[PDB]
Amino acid sequence: MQDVQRTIEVSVGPIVGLDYTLLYDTLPETVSDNITLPDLKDPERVTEDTKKLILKGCVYIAYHHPLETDTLFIKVHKHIPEFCHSFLSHLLGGEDDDNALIDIGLFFNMLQPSLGGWITKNFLRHPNRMSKDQIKMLLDQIIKMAKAESSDTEEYEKVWKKMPTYFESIIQPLLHKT
Structure with missing residues (x-):
């Protein structure tokens, strides 16, 4: 017995200000059933498939x-x-590099099999012009395509090396869509 409850310390992890117990509890059960709370604080140890599960959640x-x-x-x-x-x-x-400019034209080509029916270069440059559903489709497709080892050197240098920052710039306006 004796309060088999979370300590206050467990909510603190590497991202300052993020309540990790609240993050864990807010994620859907299909994510949190299949990870541990310390996984959220240590992406380097987590398998590729589990990283993608967490990112989709x-x-x-x-x-x-x-x-x-x-x-x-x-x-x-x-x-x-x-x-x-x-x-x-x-x-x-x-090995991401924020001095690289994401190559919108190459990324646009990469998205043609999945989003080709609606994606535009203007949408890719100005994500706030997309709807909530369009942003979610783009973010989900980025997660699906992402790999520990890129199979195309040009896509890696010109797209994936700037993708952590590009993804952050796409999910941010999603947080403010009504």
């Missing part, structure tokens, strides 16, 4: 976000973009 709760002034938003959703930056950076091999 983050997109889901970012889509279903509370108001920006809600305490839940301040402790969880506000930090999802940095959290995804970290998980995507580790997924892709950790």
